[PDB]
Ligand binder design. Structure first.
Ligand code: BAU
Ligand code: BAU
Ligand code: CO
Ligand code: CO
Ligand code: CO
Ligand code: CO
Ligand code: MG
Ligand code: MG
Lengths: 293, 293
């Protein structure tokens, strides 16, 4: 049994641990009772996406539906919103490295407090593609920074520390194998670039700020493609680094919404976009069903 | 008249601009009609905080209440949520530098498209204090990074570019003058440190990861205090940098919830916390009333 670890000798010395952004705590809640049975954590941007994911889990796998307390609705608050369906826990993380990092610190502590074991964690979401068809599901093999390097640079106090961004190889391979079973479901494995800015950080020409030319954009993106990058998003490096440090097996599965070699703004009918957006959760549902069979 | 500027020669060349994360666009909406009258933009973390701020604006200043479309509620989505009351626009930004940066790119473009002028923008929120009483409202004079330097480091394509984090001096002074009118309202001007991580980035001992000692935490925080830092949050440097680049007059006003020299977790009664949390909006309401008188 692979228990979820923390890397913090102070944590066990505390009288109580308050997970402020989850609205949970070790004294206020029975965390082993509430979460000890979690085997799969799926994380994504918005409360609504993740609530919908949990409902999909109910419908696809027949797990007990996530309970709703109507006098404490999480959506709209400063908390990360959780929706549990049997052994699957869906959690929102907002946008960007700092936002997901707060959620991950508190989630990893939660799984540790609950004495969970053999947990798989998977990020689902959207991304920009490079040189691949819009609607393609990319399974990340390695997450890279803006310089196409597999690293996450932490600032700890006033010191810079570099961490590796390795994602579980067997898991990425298993997800790719699952994808083969799904018809009309274009999938590939490739590197994923994670940036701190959506606009200039991704070579966009449509921000409030653009200090470079179209030619420089395309050169950057073509070099990224040569390095093996196939999509671009905003959470994968810190996700890979933290999950890796705490011995959790992690994967990233994102659909592309456009080919960035061609444009910066989406030009898809609404119904097609809806179709693309549900593709990662479809793969994850196949995966979980296979694991549990 | 000081119009809101962008720094992007490509923007005017586009047929249409889609502000995806605001759910607005130049073709789908009449942006000058909808927003040309905006003079004050207040930004903060959550949809609920900002909706409440807008209601407070209605009650305090008598501006028309923000309209609610019940078939398209923003809270819970991947969008930044807007609540307009007369010349005041309240907008949510989520947590952290990347999250606020996406909102700022689209907001600055919005104000430009709407031909707004003479706009003041103010971030309100919470923070950790250093060596000052919990509940203190800190008006930022300068925003600094984890190294106590007034800089914001952008990664543009694969290049690092440093930007200044100057906030409008006259504005910070005017807000401080307004605060003097409010009884039972502890306020100070000081530097604000902005970090990419809430836990190790702020010297916390309670994260899933803690790679340093209590002694090192306290030394870091004491050096920050010596530099002039009085509070710690997660958006001020990119906010100051972008607003500055686009010639918008900006300020940051955050209340402290704890003294980080003493603890990492909040220990306040709920009712006291509620009291503290509303302090920045109280100052902003005084400020706006004065400007409009
Ligand atoms: O190009 C992208 N880059 C990216 O980091 N993502 C991930 O989500 C960021 C917030 O929507 C998603 C996309 C696709 C996209 C394109 C235009 C508008 C919205 C999303
Ligand atoms: O110490 C802090 N650091 C900080 O960056 N903020 C700003 O908000 C971050 C998300 O809640 C707020 C605080 C106060 C605090 C302390 C404990 C829990 C929550 C918030
Ligand atoms: Co422990
Ligand atoms: Co490669
Ligand atoms: Co223009
Ligand atoms: Co100083
Ligand atoms: Mg193409
Ligand atoms: Mg003290």
């Amino acid at each position: 049994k692979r228990f979820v670890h923390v890397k913090n000798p102070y944590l066990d010395l505390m009288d109580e641990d308050i997970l402020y952004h989850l609205d949970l705590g070790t004294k206020t809640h029975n965390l082993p009772a509430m979460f000890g049975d979690v085997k799969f954590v799926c994380v994504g941007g918005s409360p609504n996406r993740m609530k919908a994911f949990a409902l999909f889990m109910h419908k696809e796998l027949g797990f007990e539906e996530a309970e709703e307390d109507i006098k404490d609705i999480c959506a709209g608050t400063d908390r990360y919103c959780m929706y549990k369906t049997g052994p699957v826990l869906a959690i929102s993380h907002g946008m960007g490295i700092p936002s997901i990092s707060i959620m991950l610190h508190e989630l990893i502590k939660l799984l540790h407090h609950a004495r969970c074991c053999d947990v798989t964690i998977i990020r689902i979401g959207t991304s920009g593609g490079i040189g691949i068809a819009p609607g393609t599901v990319v399974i990340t093999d390695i997450a890279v920074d803006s310089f196409f390097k597999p690293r996450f640079e932490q600032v700890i106090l006033d010191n810079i520390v570099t961490r590796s961004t390795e994602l579980d190889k067997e898991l990425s391979e298993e997800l790719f194998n699952c994808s083969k079973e799904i018809p009309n479901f274009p999938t590939l494995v490739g590197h994923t670039m994670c940036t701190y800015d959506f606009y200039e950080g991704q070579g966009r020409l449509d921000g409030a700020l653009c200090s470079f030319s179209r030619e420089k954009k395309l050169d950057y993106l073509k070099r990224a493609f040569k390095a093996g990058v196939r999509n671009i998003e905003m959470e994968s490096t810190v996700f890979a680094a933290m999950c890796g440090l705490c011995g959790l097996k992690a994967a990233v599965v994102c659909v592309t919404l456009l080919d960035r070699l061609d444009c910066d703004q989406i030009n898809l009918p609404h119904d097609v976009l809806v179709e693309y957006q549900q593709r990662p959760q479809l793969l994850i549902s196949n995966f979980i069903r296979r694991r549990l069979g």
